[PDB]
Amino acid sequence: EELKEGIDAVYPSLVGTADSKAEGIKNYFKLSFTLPEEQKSRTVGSEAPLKDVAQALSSRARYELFTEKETANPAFNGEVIKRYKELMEHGEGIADILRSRLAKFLNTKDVGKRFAQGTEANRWVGGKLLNIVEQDGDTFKYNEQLLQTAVLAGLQWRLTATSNTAIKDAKDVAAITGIDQALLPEGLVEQFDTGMTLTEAVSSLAQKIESYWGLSRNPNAPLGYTKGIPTAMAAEILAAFVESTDVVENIVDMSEIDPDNKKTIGLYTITELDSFDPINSFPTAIEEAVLVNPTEKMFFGDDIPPVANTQLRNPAVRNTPEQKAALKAEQATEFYVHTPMVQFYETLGKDRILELMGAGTLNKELLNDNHAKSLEGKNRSVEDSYNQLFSVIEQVRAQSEDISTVPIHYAYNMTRVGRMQMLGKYNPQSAKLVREAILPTKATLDLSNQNNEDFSAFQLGLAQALDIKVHTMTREVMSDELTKLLEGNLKPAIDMMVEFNTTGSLPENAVDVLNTALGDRKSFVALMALMEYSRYLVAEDKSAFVTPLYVEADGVTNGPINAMMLMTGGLFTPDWIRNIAKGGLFIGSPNKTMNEHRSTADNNDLYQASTNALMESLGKLRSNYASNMPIQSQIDSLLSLMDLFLPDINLGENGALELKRGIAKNPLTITIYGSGARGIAGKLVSSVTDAIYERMSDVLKARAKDPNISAAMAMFGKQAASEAHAEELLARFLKDMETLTSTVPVKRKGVLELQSTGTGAKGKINPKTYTIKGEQLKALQENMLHFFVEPLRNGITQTVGESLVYSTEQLQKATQIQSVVLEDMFKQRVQEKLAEKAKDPTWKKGDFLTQKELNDIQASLNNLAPMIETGSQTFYIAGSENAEVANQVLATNLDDRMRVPMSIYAPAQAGVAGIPFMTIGTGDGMMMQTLSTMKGAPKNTLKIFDGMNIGLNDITDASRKANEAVYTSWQGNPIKNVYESYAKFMKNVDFSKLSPEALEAIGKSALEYDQRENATVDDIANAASLIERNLRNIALGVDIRHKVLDKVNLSIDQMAAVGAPYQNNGKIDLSNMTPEQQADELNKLFREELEARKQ
DNA sequence: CCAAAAGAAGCGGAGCTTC
Ligand SMILES: Nc1nc2c(ncn2[C@@H]2O[C@H](COP(=O)(O)OP(=O)(O)OP(=O)(O)O)[C@@H](O)[C@H]2O)c(=O)[nH]1
Ligand SMILES: Nc1nc2c(ncn2[C@@H]2O[C@H](COP(=O)(O)OP(=O)(O)OP(=O)(O)O)[C@@H](O)[C@H]2O)c(=O)[nH]1
Ligand SMILES: O=P([O-])(O)O
Ligand SMILES: [Mg+2]
């Protein structure tokens, strides 16, 4: 414990006494931090970090000598050095702003004088920065080591923070704003996704600062200072960045949107550097100069990422030995630049790739206001992905003369749901544009003869990339489909690419050529296929054609099939057997493939099946209201409007309804994962309205080209044959929009009744300003809910089976109840420690608990079994970081603003998170982990969760391994895993100790609505133990089913495309049997095994 | 549904209050 002497030697002039018991001003920086046993930062001990690092960055030799290494990144050249010189000068400006801000803070309200007289301003939420000041005559000034080091972190953050931010979707923006997801204005998600919230900006900034400070937290110090001082610094640096215009602050007024929303929300956007700014080619020189082990860097050649010890954002969950092996294997993979695609991207140029793959140049007078904002979002994502690719290409290009021989490695970590996520936002795994330029897939193929197996593999790669559904047809039929396409519609695009692969040039009309040839086949991988096929055509040696073109072994309706296999817990039914075959589990058909299944046996997949069931359920709803003309008319109107704008809905001339797989895909999936119907309804309406806003632009684009054209032949000309036919379409639209906004269905005692809203749509349409408002969106949603979504939900249950629904409900309940108790106990143990600290004279309110105190509390919850263990994976469903534990500001800036709430790592309610956690985890997550670690694991692949990109040389073996990995994951029992955790929970829980809040929440999950009223502790305890029994019985069933199935002859082709199914070689032959016969025999084996447990 | 949370600011020195 010589840590007091150590840190005082480094900072002896900081104000106050490094004794928490001392009576005057106490220094909480020295009380909170210690020197690390091994150096973490090269700026520790430096009198002037900004001067030292600026000299370090002034030349290659100085950089190498400062980093104590023989050779620096070759990207650090003359042009990049000059840019860092200017950036170091800017750091001096930031530091100068910070010093002036401190001076003003000390002068305002005589704070400096009071602090000098003994007022403990260094313990205030806005004064924790006084812990790193030094006395300077009659005033105070920053410690220069600490100030300048924080500024260096500020500069690194400024350069790379945007590229490390998370992606905000509709759910995120809803959580941030307090506006219900379904009523979110258009472009609001775009506004919020492009910016950072305060917590988002400050916490990432604070993380950097503390990292560069290079010290270690004292476990016995209050989090109010260990987390508070760097956050205080981060907040002042953000404020300085706003003054300097490096960051823009936008306070978004929610009452402009929703008048009863009082929230005003800060949004921080970093000012973008030029795409051609040399600093982009090497944006981490500071990071790599300051830190002994840099986080932010690219991994070239034999420089490989280390293996993460803990789950992403779950410090309490250690990656298992099997997970770590998976991570090592994926980080070992070498990725390479495919030069022809980069050259193609470069030659088209940013502007043309925007025109082709985004929305091109937008003129804000032929575009609907709402549609214009969606198109701005489409352009942004493509643009950022392009710039990020070429920044990476600049760095790669410096490493060698031939860029295609520089190996690239990527860091991965295991997420909470057991997925191996590639770190970063613009890597091969996450960005489609990058995925076609940087690849691990490689093959040398003999394409000199089109009857080769090599040429067939090549064809499969091409067909899949061009939107041919390769898993639905045999290789032979596939081959003819591709040939027709290549020799037909794609031919003029192919001729252009031939010419590009000869001269390096593209014609002025390149975008038109590609757009016309590809149609709705257009994608980045489609461009890769045209590039690769044209390369083969001009290839000197077709006998040894080298290509990164891949085939994706892709999961067929993966999550739902996984759920059906992993969590169905009773006897076998013939419907289950038929429905699971749609996902590639074949019983009694040796060597059967998904290609064969879809072409000869059953052309309907699981989502098509559920759509078929929706059609049946819709008829049944129609018949219950046959005499009710207003009701029949509402239904007709909802269907009409959907038909008018959505591709997956069709109505024939005599009113025959046709539905495609695509409308059931997401609803089915997210229903299993616990979504409500309202959320599904809102999403279907969003897709309708987006199409309407898009059509409004098509109208303006018609009125400009032709002023004397009718609104009927402006909105429905491309959709209808004649003008009268376009007039009947327009009449339908106005009829539908009026009735669907003015009238809503309401469920009154199990009956549907129509009610007037009093807020129906009327008035002349102005295509530019046209917006379907919140009250009118609500009405469309309620119509969608009762007339489409509810029937879809009935259809969904029929398809996946009631037994699975029952299993997922029990899983949800157990995990929610357990999470409620963990949350509440933690909060109580925290409240009990704070009442104890209230007696401590050294302790002040605002100081929280120490890390050791929080670790003690977290470890005291272990007998409630917060972790689910599978033997190869660990899940912690309750785990979160939230502001509700400390319920207090952590730090503010020196203007009393940027008040960051204190966030704590603690358990919180799961809600429905247990279902997707366990299904994704033990489904696709376990499959991929197995695939990474299994005997003869496929090499040189890219894994994207439920599909794996494979080099053309290894498509057969890798697919068969992938299907084997699927079978392996189907030997799991997530309910058993949940049961084992919940059973331990149940012997240690004391429901009496819980708060009325916690008790109420458990009541909702464990009890029927008519029993939450007067529920005793003993009532909800008996109800909780009944769920334990239910879990036990389900887990037993799943266990038997899996054993029974292993004895039968099985062909597995869930990871489809190639036609390489895994054979389990089960010795009981169920060939030449109907599903009814198979179910009867499996059930005989079930009972046989069930009677074995009896004895 | 899930894969990461997330109002601002005056006055005063925490936490209530107004927008
Ligand atoms: N919780 C959640 N999971 C999703 C969602 N979308 C996709 N997933 C998961 O990712 C899996 C694979 O996604 P996809 O390949 O796009 O869809 P799929 O279910 O395999 O269906 P197809 O490939 O079209 O046959 C799904 O089965 C889900 O488990 C979603 O919106 N919510
Ligand atoms: N849990 C979860 N997984 C998702 C969700 N959406 C997509 N995924 C998974 O992530 C993968 C993304 O791979 P991409 O090839 O980039 O496809 P995408 O990002 O979904 O874009 P699309 O081509 O429209 O499917 C999908 O195949 C799914 O496996 C989601 O909402 N929740
Ligand atoms: O094009 P698919 O059949 O691999 O999805
Ligand atoms: Mg899939």
Side-chain angles (χ1 to χ4, degrees):
Chain A
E1 194 209 299
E2 288 166 9
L3 295 162
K4 181 178 180 163
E5 170 278 328
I7 195 146
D8 191 81
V10 187
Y11 310 100
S13 287
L14 298 188
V15 187
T17 307
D19 186 354
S20 55
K21 295 196 179 84
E23 286 214 309
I25 303 298
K26 297 166 267 301
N27 190 278
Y28 289 100
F29 182 82
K30 274 190 275 177
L31 280 173
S32 290
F33 300 98
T34 58
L35 296 175
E37 270 285 22
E38 309 203 56
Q39 193 201 208
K40 294 176 77 51
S41 169
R42 275 182 263 270
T43 63
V44 182
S46 163
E47 68 297 329
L50 260 175
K51 188 180 178 64
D52 290 7
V53 177
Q55 197 267 22
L57 296 164
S58 66
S59 83
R60 291 185 56 79
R62 284 162 201 159
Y63 193 87
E64 290 157 348
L65 213 280
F66 190 83
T67 56
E68 294 175 317
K69 291 196 180 63
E70 211 173 56
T71 184
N73 190 311
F76 195 58
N77 67 190
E79 290 285 12
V80 174
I81 292 167
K82 191 194 156 205
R83 273 268 56 216
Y84 275 104
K85 191 197 206 312
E86 300 147 15
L87 186 77
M88 287 305 100
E89 289 181 306
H90 183 52
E92 300 284 4
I94 301 302
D96 273 359
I97 294 161
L98 290 163
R99 297 180 190 106
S100 286
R101 291 180 59 84
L102 175 60
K104 281 184 211 159
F105 177 76
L106 298 163
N107 189 75
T108 310
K109 300 191 193 183
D110 284 353
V111 165
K113 221 156 281 165
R114 287 153 71 202
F115 183 57
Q117 292 162 341
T119 297
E120 281 182 287
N122 65 137
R123 307 183 81 173
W124 297 343
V125 291
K128 284 161 192 192
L129 283 184
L130 300 175
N131 292 297
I132 65 157
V133 305
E134 316 196 311
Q135 213 169 76
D136 179 33
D138 68 6
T139 193
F140 297 97
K141 48 158 215 50
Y142 280 115
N143 181 268
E144 286 299 331
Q145 175 170 327
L146 291 168
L147 177 72
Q148 297 185 17
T149 298
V151 168
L152 288 170
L155 302 170
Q156 188 55 72
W157 178 88
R158 186 262 175 270
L159 293 177
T160 55
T162 303
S163 85
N164 299 74
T165 55
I167 297 179
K168 289 187 198 75
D169 53 18
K171 164 203 151 63
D172 296 323
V173 176
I176 294 164
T177 57
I179 296 162
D180 180 76
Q181 195 175 155
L183 306 176
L184 285 174
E186 218 67 43
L188 189 71
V189 161
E190 158 72 4
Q191 204 199 354
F192 276 79
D193 184 56
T194 61
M196 297 172 98
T197 63
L198 176 74
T199 288
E200 185 179 3
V202 168
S203 79
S204 64
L205 229 182
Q207 184 283 139
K208 263 280 173 291
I209 293 158
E210 199 182 341
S211 149
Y212 284 26
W213 278 345
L215 306 176
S216 301
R217 294 178 177 191
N218 194 306
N220 299 296
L223 265 286
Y225 309 102
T226 65
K227 211 172 176 159
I229 295 155
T231 299
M233 190 74 257
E236 267 301 288
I237 283 171
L238 194 58
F241 276 144
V242 165
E243 278 194 45
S244 75
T245 323
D246 284 294
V247 169
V248 175
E249 186 183 70
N250 183 15
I251 307 300
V252 193
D253 191 1
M254 293 301 93
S255 64
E256 294 294 309
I257 300 152
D258 194 356
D260 51 35
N261 204 322
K262 312 80 47 201
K263 281 179 149 207
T264 57
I265 307 154
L267 226 47
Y268 301 87
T269 67
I270 288 165
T271 301
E272 285 203 16
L273 298 163
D274 302 307
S275 65
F276 59 85
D277 185 318
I279 223 156
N280 296 324
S281 83
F282 191 45
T284 58
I286 295 171
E287 172 92 354
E288 303 184 43
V290 166
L291 297 179
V292 178
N293 298 135
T295 331
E296 304 186 48
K297 55 177 280 202
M298 293 188 62
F299 296 87
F300 291 116
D302 298 309
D303 194 17
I304 71 152
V307 172
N309 291 322
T310 56
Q311 208 171 260
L312 201 60
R313 293 137 213 148
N314 253 153
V317 187
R318 304 203 295 201
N319 298 144
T320 66
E322 196 182 297
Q323 290 177 313
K324 279 181 165 178
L327 289 174
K328 182 182 185 174
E330 298 309 301
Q331 293 177 347
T333 301
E334 307 178 321
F335 284 76
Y336 296 92
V337 177
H338 184 231
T339 305
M341 276 304 290
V342 171
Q343 281 169 171
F344 178 64
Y345 285 160
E346 218 156 25
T347 306
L348 266 176
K350 180 149 49 184
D351 289 14
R352 280 196 290 186
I353 285 159
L354 288 173
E355 186 183 357
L356 190 60
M357 304 304 309
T361 310
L362 313 167
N363 84 315
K364 304 287 280 83
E365 45 207 74
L366 304 195
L367 259 43
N368 179 93
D369 289 345
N370 306 116
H371 185 225
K373 293 169 171 178
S374 288
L375 297 179
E376 278 146 44
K378 194 136 279 157
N379 275 167
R380 177 266 177 161
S381 170
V382 177
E383 175 162 13
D384 295 351
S385 194
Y386 180 96
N387 294 329
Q388 195 65 26
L389 177 60
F390 282 84
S391 287
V392 168
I393 300 301
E394 302 281 53
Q395 190 164 167
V396 182
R397 195 184 273 107
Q399 316 300 310
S400 149
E401 189 72 36
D402 195 346
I403 53 166
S404 62
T405 50
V406 189
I408 305 163
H409 290 90
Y410 293 96
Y412 288 74
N413 204 353
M414 217 64 61
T415 67
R416 285 148 137 91
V417 297
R419 282 184 172 180
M420 293 193 278
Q421 204 163 75
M422 210 188 250
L423 301 193
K425 199 152 73 169
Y426 302 107
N427 54 55
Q429 195 186 58
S430 69
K432 288 173 167 78
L433 187 155
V434 178
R435 193 181 304 161
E436 305 317 317
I438 301 181
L439 310 281
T441 50
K442 260 280 262 70
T444 310
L445 300 171
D446 191 343
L447 306 179
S448 63
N449 175 16
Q450 303 185 138
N451 280 64
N452 295 180
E453 287 297 302
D454 285 1
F455 196 82
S456 182
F458 188 58
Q459 288 190 303
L460 182 64
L462 301 172
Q464 187 178 236
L466 269 350
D467 261 332
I468 288 150
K469 296 306 174 291
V470 296
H471 81 277
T472 72
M473 65 194 66
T474 64
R475 194 79 60 85
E476 297 78 2
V477 172
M478 173 284 293
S479 160
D480 292 329
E481 302 219 340
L482 176 64
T483 310
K484 174 83 165 181
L485 208 66
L486 288 174
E487 215 54 66
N489 252 141
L490 300 185
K491 178 83 163 161
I494 293 298
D495 297 342
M496 182 185 82
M497 299 302 285
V498 162
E499 166 67 22
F500 178 76
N501 284 290
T502 314
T503 70
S505 92
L506 292 172
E508 279 280 336
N509 72 163
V511 170
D512 220 85
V513 175
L514 294 153
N515 231 280
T516 298
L518 291 162
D520 68 15
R521 303 177 184 280
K522 189 175 58 175
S523 64
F524 288 104
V525 73
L527 304 174
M528 171 66 139
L530 300 173
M531 167 61 63
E532 290 312 279
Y533 181 72
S534 71
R535 274 191 67 231
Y536 146 81
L537 291 181
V538 309
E540 301 277 61
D541 191 10
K542 278 164 178 55
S543 197
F545 182 69
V546 173
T547 182
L549 194 76
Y550 54 79
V551 166
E552 184 177 38
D554 187 34
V556 177
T557 65
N558 180 83
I561 292 300
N562 281 333
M564 286 172 63
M565 258 306 289
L566 287 164
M567 288 176 290
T568 301
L571 293 170
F572 299 89
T573 58
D575 291 327
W576 183 89
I577 291 173
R578 282 188 288 267
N579 283 347
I580 208 81
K582 295 166 191 294
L585 177 49
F586 308 120
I587 303 166
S589 314
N591 308 294
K592 187 175 174 185
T593 71
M594 177 59 67
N595 318 259
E596 289 164 354
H597 190 247
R598 282 294 254 86
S599 58
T600 61
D602 188 352
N603 201 46
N604 298 322
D605 64 29
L606 206 69
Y607 304 148
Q608 189 57 234
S610 70
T611 304
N612 292 344
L614 159 58
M615 282 184 268
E616 279 134 32
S617 210
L618 212 164
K620 284 178 155 299
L621 186 65
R622 276 211 187 270
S623 301
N624 287 205
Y625 298 94
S627 80
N628 200 306
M629 275 191 65
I631 296 279
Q632 294 301 317
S633 183
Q634 279 301 288
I635 300 164
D636 283 356
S637 267
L638 178 70
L639 299 187
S640 169
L641 189 70
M642 294 178 78
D643 171 79
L644 227 40
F645 292 97
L646 301 178
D648 293 317
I649 325 289
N650 283 288
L651 290 164
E653 179 148 68
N654 55 34
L657 185 64
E658 177 209 320
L659 301 169
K660 300 173 179 188
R661 105 193 274 274
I663 39 83
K665 177 164 165 45
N666 199 251
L668 179 323
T669 299
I670 76 173
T671 287
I672 294 181
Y673 294 153
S675 176
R678 231 158 296 265
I680 295 160
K683 210 185 187 182
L684 291 154
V685 167
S686 261
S687 74
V688 173
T689 56
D690 281 351
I692 297 169
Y693 298 145
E694 185 195 30
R695 197 68 65 87
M696 292 286 84
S697 294
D698 294 357
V699 178
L700 289 165
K701 211 161 80 178
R703 259 81 171 273
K705 155 196 64 67
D706 190 347
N708 286 316
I709 203 73
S710 61
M713 274 302 219
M715 207 185 305
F716 298 100
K718 284 201 160 291
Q719 288 70 217
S722 68
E723 184 190 23
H725 221 111
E727 198 69 58
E728 69 196 52
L729 288 186
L730 174 61
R732 275 175 53 192
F733 172 75
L734 297 173
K735 192 265 171 195
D736 302 338
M737 280 296 309
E738 187 160 341
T739 199
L740 294 167
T741 59
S742 60
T743 306
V744 287
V746 178
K747 226 201 199 75
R748 300 267 159 184
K749 287 143 277 296
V751 181
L752 291 173
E753 291 175 27
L754 290 186
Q755 279 176 26
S756 282
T757 59
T759 164
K762 208 53 264 154
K764 177 85 168 183
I765 294 166
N766 178 207
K768 178 87 158 69
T769 44
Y770 181 77
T771 313
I772 296 151
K773 245 59 207 290
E775 41 189 48
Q776 297 175 176
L777 277 178
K778 244 172 57 63
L780 299 171
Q781 178 173 351
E782 293 313 285
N783 278 291
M784 191 65 75
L785 179 61
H786 301 287
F787 299 135
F788 198 82
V789 176
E790 305 271 52
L792 179 47
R793 296 269 271 199
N794 296 346
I796 288 156
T797 300
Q798 193 194 313
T799 315
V800 299
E802 305 179 32
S803 180
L804 167 66
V805 182
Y806 172 71
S807 271
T808 62
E809 289 165 340
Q810 292 308 116
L811 164 53
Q812 194 269 138
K813 291 173 172 194
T815 57
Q816 172 65 354
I817 293 162
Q818 200 171 145
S819 74
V820 178
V821 175
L822 292 162
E823 178 180 74
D824 189 78
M825 287 324 297
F826 198 97
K827 273 178 174 162
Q828 281 180 196
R829 311 262 158 85
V830 163
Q831 251 14 280
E832 280 162 35
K833 254 287 185 279
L834 289 165
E836 197 187 309
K837 293 303 282 187
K839 304 161 192 172
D840 202 321
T842 78
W843 186 87
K844 189 204 174 190
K845 204 169 193 303
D847 307 8
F848 195 52
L849 308 175
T850 69
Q851 189 57 56
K852 190 215 171 283
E853 281 163 19
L854 287 171
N855 296 351
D856 290 351
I857 295 172
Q858 174 72 212
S860 83
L861 296 178
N862 285 1
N863 74 341
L864 306 181
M867 312 281 173
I868 295 164
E869 315 283 348
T870 73
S872 57
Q873 293 173 121
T874 311
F875 305 96
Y876 176 29
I877 301 168
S880 70
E881 193 155 44
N882 71 117
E884 275 68 47
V885 181
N887 199 45
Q888 62 169 248
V889 173
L890 174 61
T892 77
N893 71 27
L894 300 170
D895 285 329
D896 192 46
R897 293 179 197 200
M898 295 185 181
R899 316 191 187 169
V900 193
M902 186 172 205
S903 263
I904 298 298
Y905 187 72
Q909 287 189 30
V912 294
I915 309 167
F917 263 62
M918 292 313 290
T919 307
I920 290 159
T922 64
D924 67 61
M926 181 55 181
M927 177 217 284
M928 288 302 201
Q929 178 174 302
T930 297
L931 215 25
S932 285
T933 58
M934 67 189 298
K935 173 215 185 77
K939 260 94 185 260
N940 310 322
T941 63
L942 169 66
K943 296 167 173 75
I944 309 156
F945 312 129
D946 84 307
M948 184 176 68
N949 291 169
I950 306 156
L952 297 186
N953 65 127
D954 206 35
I955 59 162
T956 306
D957 192 77
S959 290
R960 198 178 283 113
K961 295 286 197 300
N963 286 126
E964 185 173 6
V966 171
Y967 189 62
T968 297
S969 74
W970 286 347
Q971 302 311 300
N973 196 336
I975 299 282
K976 185 184 154 167
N977 306 328
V978 175
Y979 164 74
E980 296 176 318
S981 161
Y982 192 78
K984 192 165 164 195
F985 163 73
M986 279 312 295
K987 34 167 67 195
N988 290 297
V989 61
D990 189 348
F991 287 104
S992 75
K993 288 209 154 218
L994 298 164
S995 71
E997 288 85 68
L999 218 287
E1000 195 157 22
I1002 294 156
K1004 280 178 188 175
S1005 300
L1007 295 170
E1008 208 75 51
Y1009 184 78
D1010 50 79
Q1011 285 146 38
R1012 279 86 134 284
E1013 32 161 307
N1014 57 338
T1016 62
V1017 172
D1018 297 353
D1019 277 343
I1020 75 111
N1022 186 241
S1025 54
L1026 212 79
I1027 290 153
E1028 185 189 340
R1029 187 172 290 103
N1030 296 167
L1031 259 26
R1032 195 181 67 69
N1033 290 149
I1034 293 170
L1036 222 291
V1038 176
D1039 193 80
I1040 308 287
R1041 283 173 64 97
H1042 290 346
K1043 272 178 170 144
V1044 159
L1045 234 23
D1046 194 11
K1047 310 171 92 289
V1048 154
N1049 55 341
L1050 259 29
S1051 191
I1052 294 94
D1053 202 16
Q1054 151 69 18
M1055 297 290 277
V1058 174
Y1062 175 72
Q1063 311 302 299
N1064 83 322
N1065 292 309
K1067 299 275 78 180
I1068 294 160
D1069 182 349
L1070 300 198
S1071 64
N1072 305 316
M1073 298 181 189
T1074 76
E1076 288 75 22
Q1077 277 170 284
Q1078 291 174 332
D1080 291 351
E1081 177 63 39
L1082 291 168
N1083 287 339
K1084 169 186 143 287
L1085 296 170
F1086 192 112
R1087 282 183 278 271
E1088 194 182 62
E1089 203 63 275
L1090 201 281
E1091 278 302 76
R1093 293 295 88 81
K1094 198 266 183 172
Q1095 298 154 32

